[PDB]
Amino acid sequence: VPMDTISGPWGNNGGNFWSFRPVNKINQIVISYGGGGNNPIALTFSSTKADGSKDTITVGGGGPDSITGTEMVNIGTDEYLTGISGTFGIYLDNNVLRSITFTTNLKAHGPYGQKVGTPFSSANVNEIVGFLGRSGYYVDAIGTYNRH
Amino acid sequence: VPMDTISGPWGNNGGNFWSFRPVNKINQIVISYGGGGNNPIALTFSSTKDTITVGGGGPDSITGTEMVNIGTDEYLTGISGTFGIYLDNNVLRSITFTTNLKAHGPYGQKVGTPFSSANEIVGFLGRSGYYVDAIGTYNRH
Ligand SMILES: CO[C@H]1O[C@H](CO[C@H]2O[C@H](CO)[C@@H](O)[C@H](O)[C@@H]2O[C@@H]2O[C@H](CO)[C@@H](O)[C@H](O)[C@H]2NC(C)=O)[C@@H](O[C@@H]2O[C@H](CO)[C@@H](O)[C@H](O)[C@H]2NC(C)=O)[C@H](O[C@H]2O[C@H](CO)[C@@H](O)[C@H](O)[C@@H]2O[C@@H]2O[C@H](CO)[C@@H](O)[C@H](O)[C@H]2NC(C)=O)[C@@H]1O
């Protein structure tokens, strides 16, 4: 049984594995921030079905950390995710996701968070049809599922 | 400059180092529990005022406490207990505080790997975060 090509994951081995590849396009992403600054702590990916129901996952933000702010990625009708990039660095003695950018066929959304630490970038070829990685209190790792 | 004899510590490398050796006798120990059960999450050592609390660094709410009251002619002499897994953490599961008079405990659930010290206990040290990762004693004969 064939399975979608994984790019990455990028990051480290903390937290718990997570995966989300819905059968319908991911049209909305919420970046949750903590600590009063631009510190990403959680990601929500959602895909709205024709009937009004949503496929959704939230990863990271597994702790008591108060959500202090959110940013959103809105993916339009003739828009689709093509690439991701960002940085992994230290947030409160944790090597985690520090910034993230979501590229579509139409624009780059972001940067979301703080451009600090070790950078990573997906291969510029392609459609991103899902995400996977590791998370706990924050986002420990992230990669993509891909289909050309 | 001499320093008091350390026994142990026992446990693992989790959490942060802690240490408490007061010049006044430790007369009370509070054992804090979490998750509605017999699961120790924090230890408070207090002197006749010197005090420390170790563990309980999480949002985990305290669901109960128990107390050792050390008598005026009583003093700590040994410790023992177990370490094991509590919510994906290899931490302290039970502890017994022995004095010249009696063993106090056990406090918690006697599950996991046992330990026991080989005297007066004059303080404690260890590692802690959300729970108690390690524990040992300062000693003076
Ligand atoms: C529920 O408590 C656990 O998770 C705490 C947060 O760490 C999680 O999130 C990060 C980032 O996403 C991730 O990398 C971790 O793996 C962990 O996720 C958990 O992963 C395990 C599998 O590994 C999985 O089973 C769990 O489901 C998953 N949790 C969730 C909610 O999904 C963690 O506290 C963090 O621990 C790391 C070191 O592992 C540390 O760097 C972080 O600074 C610290 N976070 C915070 C907010 O303090 C919990 O562990 C605590 O307490 C334990 C018990 O006493 C200790 O053994 C741990 O070491 C840690 O204490 C911290 O220790 C570091 C030094 O090691 C010290 O700098 C901190 O001060 C101290 N914390 C305190 C309060 O003193 C526990 O794993």
Residue numbers in the entry:
A (entry chain B): 3 to 127, 130 to 152
B (entry chain A): 3 to 50, 56 to 125, 130 to 152
Reproduce the article's own wording on this structure.
In an attempt to obtain such “snapshots” of biantennary N-glycan, we selected for crystallographic studies two unrelated plant lectins, Calsepa from Calystegia sepium and PHA-E from Phaseolus vulgaris, which show 4- to 5-fold increase in affinity toward bisected biantennary N-glycans compared with control non-bisected glycan. The most populated conformation of bisected N-glycan is termed the ‘back-fold’ conformation, in which the α1–6 arm is flipped back towards the stem region of N-glycan (GlcNAcβ1–4GlcNAc). In summary, our study provides the first atomic structures of a flipped-back conformation of bisected N-glycan bound to two specific lectins. Thus both proteins, PHA-E as well as Calsepa, are specifically ‘back-fold conformer selective’, rather than broad bisecting GlcNAc-selective lectins.
Calsepa lectin (16 kDa) belongs to mannose-binding type Jacalin-related lectin, and was found to show relatively higher affinity toward bisected glycans than non-bisected glycans. The asymmetric unit contains four Calsepa molecules and two bisected glycans. Two Calsepa molecules sandwich one bisected glycan via an extensive hydrogen bond network as listed in Table S1. In the Calsepa-glycan complex, the α1–6 branch of the glycan is flipped backward (ϕα1–6 = 95, φα1–6 = 105, ωα1–6 = 58) and the conformation is classified as back-fold. Two GlcNAc residues, GlcNAc-5 and GlcNAc-7, are aligned in parallel and the putative hydrogen atoms (H2 and H4) of GlcNAc-7 can make van der Waals contact with the hydrogen atoms (H1, H3 and H5) of GlcNAc-5. In addition, one hydrogen bond is observed between NH group of GlcNAc-5 and N-acetyl carbonyl oxygen atom of GlcNAc-7. The back-fold conformation seems essential to attain the sandwich-like 2:1 interaction. In summary, Calsepa lectin can be considered ‘back-fold conformer selective’, and will not favor a glycan with an extend conformation.
